[PDB]
UniProtKB/Swiss-Prot annotation:
Gene transcribed to yield this protein: Por
Positions annotated to bind FAD: 362, 392-395, 410-412, 416, 426-429, 612
Catalytic reaction(s) noted: 2 oxidized [cytochrome P450] + NADPH = 2 reduced [cytochrome P450] + NADP(+) + H(+)
Gene3D superfamilies referenced in this protein's UniProt entry, alphabetically: 3.40.50.360, NADPH-cytochrome p450 Reductase, Chain A, domain 3, Nucleotide-binding domain of ferredoxin-NADP reductase (FNR) module, Translation factors
Annotated FAD-binding FR-type domain residues: 217-456
Swiss-Prot/TrEMBL cofactor(s): FAD; FMN
Protein name from the UniProt record: NADPH--cytochrome P450 reductase
UniProt GO molecular function: cytochrome-b5 reductase activity, acting on NAD(P)H; electron transfer activity; enzyme binding; flavin adenine dinucleotide binding; FMN binding; hydrolase activity; iron-cytochrome-c reductase activity; NADP binding
Secretion signal, residue range per the UniProt entry: none
Keyword Transmembrane helix: yes
Gene Ontology cellular component list: cytosol; endoplasmic reticulum membrane; intracellular membrane-bounded organelle
UniProt-annotated binding residues for NADP(+): 236, 470, 531-532, 537-541, 574
Length: 613
């Protein structure tokens, strides 16, 4: 990872006084940065965004060489309160450096989520650390809560931030407003076909010419071997997929995640085009008007609107306030121009409307286009606004020791009645479902992501796995592997599964496979919880609570490892208590002593989580 030159120097040479580093994976932090960066301009200053992984943040000490200089960090938290991948260098650095940042003015906005225990560790860290080094805080730390509404949290913060800035430095709010574009449109007519991106993510033609290694930037088109329906009932659609990675040299261990780069719904794309009156089959490119930025285009180019809407753009999520504000200009009917503008208010009714009519109603772009017919923006400007389509992750359901040449996926297809009035569909799950094992084959641009979730190294350590619904996913690989080790002579301690589902004839995933593993003995216990076969709910905690005596015997004496995968707002929290209570009873020990004991197993590597909401 060859770093770029002193960003301070670039700022000097490009007349910029504020830089906004973004630490993110799904791009939300990146978005905020770009917004905060563009914002800078309307207040007499000029800023720029930047990936800290491309620079050496050691130069912060040089930043004071620029008048009215100030750095801003938009950081998100992951894993064990860990930084985003790209924010890793920055982190390790802040920890090891002793550098003096005297004269450095900063501000930090962190993206977190209250379900997790390490709420905005990064944000809190950077803010607090930069001070210890010497830099002076120009504005309070921002704690954005995604479980509530990060967007609004950002708004509220941003709104107070600029004035503070303006005041500390004595600068004007320079009239504000009047749309400013980032890219410039360039339509191509002669464009040699063989050089137009068709949905590749990295180098031109990387999808056709597959050359390792394969990473997020160079995914590996994997053939869909099997795509079966796992649920017996019809309430929902749960599926088991098997991606063939032969000849990819891609390594992986049960507990890792695999990511996919899906394609939006054809019909949904056609309509956006149609309702705008634009020819989606036009070949074009959006070159940055700043001939200095490294981000030459909003996405791969040259390409066609259809390709961008289909593979490069997120056209299904609720548009964020700034995208709607920018569009307000393209709505002829005033009534509508107003709502759109108002969408980015910090408070008032504008806020409530953006919160219920857009977010709560899950209204995506096309929906808003249909509901505000006077809104007919230019297709090229829309693409510059829409955010980038992300890859979806999946707990690899298989074990490397048994399926080295294949990755398995257990997923629940997303589909629901939105209050917007229509039916929304999960981008990747709908895409995945439509893959028929069968150019001709069914390929899925994927790539693996290593994780922390891992079976114990020592084959005799007791494993306790709590994974209701699709939470069982990673655990299918766990059991396969522990089954293997036994067929390999290896001595295997207890292996217990604590699974859950509605009814044994609705969503009892791997009812049969799990039946085998149990019969043969691979699974010491197979405690399953049918939450709907009786008046009262029977969740997995109840089972854990039921086996308190035994579990505590492997946790406290057998040094067993606890694994938790699935829902994070409830399932995980409820389970975590039950463990507090098991420890507190059989300890014995007050709640506090127990809560700690558990959290220790958590840090001492014996209690792993892998939840989301
Ligand atoms: C580390 C990790 C591991 C994961 N492992 C798995 C796994 O093993 N199996 C699996 O199925 N998924 C897993 N996921 C979730 C997975 O990545 C996808 O989010 C999921 O498959 C749906 O993606 P989609 O693109 O089809 O849906 P999208 O189009 O992206 O839509 C999903 C979004 O729609 C919204 N939504 C969903 N239902 C409703 C509703 N009823 N009403 C209103 N809004 C709603 C939510 O905001 C949700 O985030 C994992 C995620 C992470 C981060
Ligand atoms: N981050 C990850 O790695 C990961 C992996 C898998 C799933 N998930 C997340 O979990 C959510 C749902 O997953 P899912 O569809 O697969 O599960 P699910 O089908 O919705 O539910 C599975 C089982 O859990 C039960 N349940 C509901 N509330 C519970 C509680 N408080 N304690 C214990 N069991 C409870 C259900 O019963 P009832 O419905 O009848 O109440 C059912 O028996 C999604 O939001 C998804 O993001 C995250
Ligand atoms: C796998 C995963 C792990 C997360 N872990 C944490 C965490 O430990 N602490 C926290 O405060 N937020 C956590 N979050 C929430 C994110 O910090 C939040 O969604 C943020 O907006 C992500 O930023 P991005 O879009 O810029 O990548 C996690 C999200 C995911 C999907």
């Amino acid at each position: 990872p060859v770093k770029e030159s002193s960003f301070v120097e670039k700022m000097k040479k490009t007349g910029r006084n504020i830089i906004v580093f973004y630490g993110s994976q799904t791009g939300t932090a990146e978005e905020f940065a770009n917004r905060l960066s563009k914002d800078a301009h309307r207040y007499g200053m000029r800023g720029m965004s930047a990936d800290p992984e491309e620079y050496d943040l050691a130069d912060l000490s040089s930043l004071p060489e620029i008048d009215k200089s100030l750095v801003v960090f938009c950081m998100a938290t992951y894993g064990e309160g860990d930084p985003t991948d790209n924010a890793q260098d920055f982190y390790d650095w802040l920890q090891e450096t002793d550098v003096d940042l005297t004269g450095v003015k900063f501000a930090v906005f962190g993206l977190g989520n209250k379900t997790y225990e390490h709420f905005n560790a990064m944000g809190k860290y950077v803010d607090q650390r930069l001070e210890q080094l010497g830099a002076q805080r120009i504005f309070e730390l921002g704690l954005g809560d995604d479980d509530g509404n990060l967007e609004e949290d950002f708004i509220t913060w941003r709104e107070q931030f600029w004035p503070a800035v303006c005041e500390f430095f004595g600068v004007e709010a320079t009239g504000e407003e009047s749309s400013i574009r980032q890219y410039e449109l360039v339509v191509h007519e002669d464009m040699d076909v063989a050089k137009v991106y068709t949905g590749e993510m990295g180098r031109l033609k990387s999808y056709e010419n597959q050359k390792p290694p394969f990473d997020a930037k160079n995914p590996f088109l994997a053939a869909v071997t099997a795509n079966r329906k796992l649920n017996q009932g019809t309430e929902r659609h749960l599926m088991h997929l098997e991606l063939d990675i032969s000849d990819s040299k891609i390594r992986y261990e049960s507990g890792d995640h695999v990511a996919v780069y899906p394609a939006n719904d054809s019909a949904l794309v056609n309509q956006i085009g149609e309702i705008l009156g634009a020819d989606l089959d036009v070949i074009m490119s959006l070159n940055n008007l700043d001939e200095e930025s490294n981000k030459k285009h909003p996405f791969p180019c040259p390409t066609t609107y259809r390709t961008a809407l289909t593979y490069y753009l997120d056209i299904t999520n609720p548009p964020r306030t700034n995208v709607l504000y920018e569009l307000a200009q393209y709505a002829s009917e005033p009534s509508e121009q107003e709502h759109l503008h108002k969408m980015a208010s910090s408070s008032g009714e504008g806020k409530e409307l953006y919160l219920s009519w857009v977010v709560e109603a899950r209204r995506h772009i096309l929906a808003i286009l249909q509901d505000y017919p006077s809104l007919r923006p230019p297709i090229d400007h829309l693409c510059e606004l829409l955010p980038r389509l992300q890859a979806r992750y999946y707990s690899i359901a298989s074990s490397s020791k048994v399926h080295p040449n294949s990755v398995h996926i257990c997923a629940v297809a997303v589909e629901y009645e939105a209050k917007s009035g229509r039916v929304n569909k999960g981008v990747a799950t709908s895409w995945l479902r439509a893959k028929e094992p069968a150019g001709g084959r069914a390929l899925v641009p994927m790539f693996v992501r290593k994780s922390q979730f891992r079976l114990p190294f020592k084959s005799t350590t007791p494993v306790i796995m709590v994974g209701p619904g699709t939470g069982i996913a990673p655990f299918m690989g766990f059991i396969q592997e522990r089954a293997w080790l036994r067929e390999q002579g290896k001595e295997v301690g207890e292996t217990l599964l604590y699974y859950g589902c509605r009814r044994s004839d609705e969503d009892y995933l791997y009812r049969e496979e799990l039946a085998r593993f149990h019969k043969d003995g691979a699974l010491t216990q197979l405690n399953v919880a049918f939450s709907r076969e009786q008046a009262h709910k029977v969740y997995v905690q109840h089972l854990l609570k039921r086996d308190r005596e035994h579990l505590w015997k492997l946790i406290h004496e057998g040094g067993a490892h606890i694994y938790v995968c699935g829902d994070a707002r409830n399932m995980a929290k409820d389970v975590q208590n039950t463990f507090y209570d098991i420890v507190a009873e059989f300890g014995p020990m007050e709640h506090t002593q127990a809560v700690d004991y558990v959290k220790k197993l958590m840090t001492k590597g014996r209690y792993s989580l892998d939840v989301g909401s």
